[PDB]
A paper describes a structure:
Here, we discover a family of Bdellovibrio proteins that define a new subgrouping of the lysozyme superfamily and demonstrate that they possess outright specificity for deacetylated peptidoglycan. We solve the structure of family member Bd0314 (that we named DslA), revealing adaptations to the lysozyme fold that sterically restrict the active-site cleft into only accepting polymers deacetylated at the GlcNAc positions. We determine a role for DslA in B. bacteriovorus exit from the prey cell and demonstrate that exogenously added enzyme is able to prematurely liberate predators from prey bdelloplasts before completion of the predatory lifecycle. The architecture of DslA is related to, but significantly different from, other members of the lysozyme superfamily but still fulfil the inclusion criteria for the lysozyme superfamily noted by Monzingo et al. — conservation of the β-sheet floor and helices D and F, with appropriate placement of acidic catalytic residues.
Using the DslA structure as a guide, we next monitored the activity of DslA mutants for the putative active-site residues. Variants E143Q and E154Q clearly fold and retain a similar active-site architecture (as judged by our high-resolution structures herein), but display no notable activity (middle), confirming their participation in catalysis. The lysozyme superfamily has a conserved ES motif at the C terminus of a central α-helix, which is readily identifiable as E143/S144 on DslA helix D. Residue E143 of the conserved ES motif would act as a general acid, protonating the equatorial linkage between MurNAc and GlcN, with E154 acting as a general base to activate water to attack the MurNAc C1 in an axial orientation. The structural equivalence of DslA E154 to the β1 secondary catalytic acid residues of goose-type lysozymes (also GH23, but with a second catalytic residue lacking in the lytic transglycosylases), v-type lysozymes and chitosanases, and our assay on the E143Q and E154Q mutants argues for an inverting hydrolytic mechanism for DslA. All four of our DslA structures (two wild-type, E143Q, E154Q) are highly similar, other than a relatively small flexation of the β1–2 hairpin in the E154Q variant. Additional controls were performed using EDTA plus DslA with one of the catalytic site residues inactivated (E143Q), or using conventional hen egg-white lysozyme (HEWL) or buffer only. The percentage of prematurely released, external predator cells increased significantly when early bdelloplasts were treated by exogenous addition of DslA, whereas no significant change was detected for the treatment controls DslA E143Q, HEWL or buffer only.
Numbering used by the authors: 0 to 181
The structure:
Amino acid sequence: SREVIPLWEDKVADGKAWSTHVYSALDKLGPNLLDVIPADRSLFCPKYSSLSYAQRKQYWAFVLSSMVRFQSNFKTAMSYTEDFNDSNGNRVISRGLLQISIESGNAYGCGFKSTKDLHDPLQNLSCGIRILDRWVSRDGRIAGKVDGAWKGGARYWSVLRAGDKTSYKSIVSWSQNLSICK
């Protein structure tokens, strides 16, 4: 009786298993995320404050799938060499569905043992829950720039940072037009 279905279920063979993992991992890794009433709800989900717990898990699984859509187009094997360095002076390699890197990701407690673990879709999605759980809850908002500093998920993901990008405008549009949000 879900009202909102994540985009990875449309094409990905394991898409339903990904959703089941996210719904369960949200209980364990996103309890702070799911207690926030975000200050930019008027932008992302106008009716956020009336969502049940189950609807908020449906919402965050959808938003994660919309980020995956533009980060990796659902390709868990994807890697991308960035413009900047890790602390050792090697260019950062972003990996997997949400394009997380091992050094910055492991700072969230994601516990990646090796780079191969970032291409494990379940570990990758769990890490993205951890990142959101930290910053959406600390900043009290999903994204946006407040007094010259990016907030919420935009702290980590440039795909959530406002601008004239198809990715950002689509994530915003898809979120705010979910039946449970509008």
